[PDB]
Amino acid sequence: SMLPRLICINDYEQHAKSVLPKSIYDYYRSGANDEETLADNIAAFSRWKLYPRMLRNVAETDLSTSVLGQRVSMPICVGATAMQRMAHVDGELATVRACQSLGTGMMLSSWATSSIEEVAEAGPEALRWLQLYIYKDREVTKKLVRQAEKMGYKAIFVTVDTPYLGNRLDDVRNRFLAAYVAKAIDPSISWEDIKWLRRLTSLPIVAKGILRGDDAREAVKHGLNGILVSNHGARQLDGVPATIDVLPEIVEAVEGKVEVFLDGGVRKGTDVLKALALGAKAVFVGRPIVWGLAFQGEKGVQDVLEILKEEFRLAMALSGCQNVKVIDKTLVRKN
Ligand SMILES: NS(=O)(=O)c1ccc(Cc2c(-c3ccc(F)c(-c4ccc(Oc5[nH]nnc5C(=O)O)cc4)c3)nn(-c3nc(C(=O)O)cs3)c2CC2CC2)cc1F
Numbered sequence: 596s597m598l599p600r601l602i603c604i605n606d607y608e609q610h611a612k613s614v615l616p617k618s619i620y621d622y623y624r625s626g627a628n629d630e631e632t633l634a635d636n637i638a639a640f641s642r643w644k645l646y647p648r649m650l651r652n653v654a655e656t657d658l659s660t661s662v663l664g665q666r667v668s669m670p671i672c673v674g675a676t677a678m679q680r681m682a683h684v685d686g687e688l689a690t691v692r693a694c695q696s697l698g699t700g701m702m703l704s705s706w707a708t709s710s711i712e713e714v715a716e717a718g719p720e721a722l723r724w725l726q727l728y729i730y731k732d733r734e735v736t737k738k739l740v741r742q743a744e745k746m747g748y749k750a751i752f753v754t755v756d757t758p759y760l761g762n763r764l765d766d767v768r769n770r771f772l773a774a775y776v777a778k779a780i781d782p783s784i785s786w787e788d789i790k791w792l793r794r795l796t797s798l799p800i801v802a803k804g805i806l807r808g809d810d811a812r813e814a815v816k817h818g819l820n821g822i823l824v825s826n827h828g829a830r831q832l833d834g835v836p837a838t839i840d841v842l843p844e845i846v847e848a849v850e851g852k853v854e855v856f857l858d859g860g861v862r863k864g865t866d867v868l869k870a871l872a873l874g875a876k877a878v879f880v881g882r883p884i885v886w887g888l889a890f891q892g893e894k895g896v897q898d899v900l901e902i903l904k905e906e907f908r909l910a911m912a913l914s915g916c917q918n919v920k921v922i923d924k925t926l927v928r929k930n
Pocket residue numbers: 677678705706707708709710711730732735757772775776779827830
């Protein structure tokens with residue numbers, strides 16, 4: 596009952612725009628270039644129509660599932676978002692605490708405003724994963740992985756779509772990064788560097804930012820454990836498809852050999868249901884978490900995750916799904 600009265604994820608965004616400095620809100624909101632993919636990440640979900648089954652018995656809903664062999668309370672997890680401390684003083688420590696309370700997983704940015712150890716201490720019982728860039732400096736890359744293994748993180752999400760930073764026009768206009776990303780991130784990396792990381796760690800490895808069937812198959816062939824279908828929140832290459840539109844081609848391409856996840860434009864419970872109906876194991880949210888932080892730190896993130904949880908529960912119930920095992924491709928049809 597905290598004010599203003601926010602009852603959906605778009606209310607959290609509207610609140611954030613009213614309290615964040617322009618250049619911070621713009622950094623978090625922006626897509627790349629004309630933001631074609633940004634609009635489509637959202638619009639594409641509306642074109643997938645639901646076909647609810649009546650009279651299935653939805654008295655008891657169970658949202659529980661597993662990610663990479665680890666139980667979660669719901670198929671709705673926190674994605675890596677850099678610079679959470681610009682949204683709230685507690686930053687990633689607030690986030691992990693909310694994930695611990697919800698029983699869901701947090702993917703930590705490889706350049707978070709909090710250390711791998713600090714986040715493990717704030718959230719010792721939270722399911723925690725590390726998002727990894729392969730830096731030009733492979734010694735710091737290796738150290739992050741070792742620190743993740745040591746601090747009880749359960750997987751590496753290696754981001755492969757950012758050899759350079761996307762062109763976000765508001766960040767250029769605000770004089771808000773591309774030059775710094777280009778100093779640290781290695782744009783030379785290939786499947787050879789994936790072989791290296793696959794040998795470096797026995798943690799589960801997900802390739803984050805695949806949009807092609809052939810690349811997904813290359814990821815399976817290299818012993819990777821998951822695909823995160825991502826266009827990096829439409830902040831990298833503008834004019835790529837919406838993740839919900841390429842998800843089915845990627846699911847088909849991997850023939851059940853690895854878990855397939857989605858991010859990009861998840862705002863509502865029906866977005867989660869549509870993604871699972873098309874074969875995603877779970878979805879990740881980026882921006883909604885930041886809007887949560889901007890509203891009220893830990894409680895704001897908990898609020899956003901609880902809103903998505905309960906929207907998802909209702910969408911499951913109204914569609915005749917008592918649990919995620921019964922969510923099938925006949926629930927959806929593109930229009
Ligand atoms: N609390 S803490 O001590 O752990 C802490 C961690 C991180 C930072 C910030 C940081 C930046 C750093 C700077 C300035 C920045 F502006 C950024 C940055 C912020 C947001 C970005 O946004 C995105 N990344 N991926 N996608 C996006 C997007 O916006 O879509 C990118 C870069 C990073 N680099 N950097 C690197 N150093 C090396 C190297 O060779 O030694 C390799 S990485 C680090 C340390 C990190 C360990 C590696 C400070 C600490 F205090």
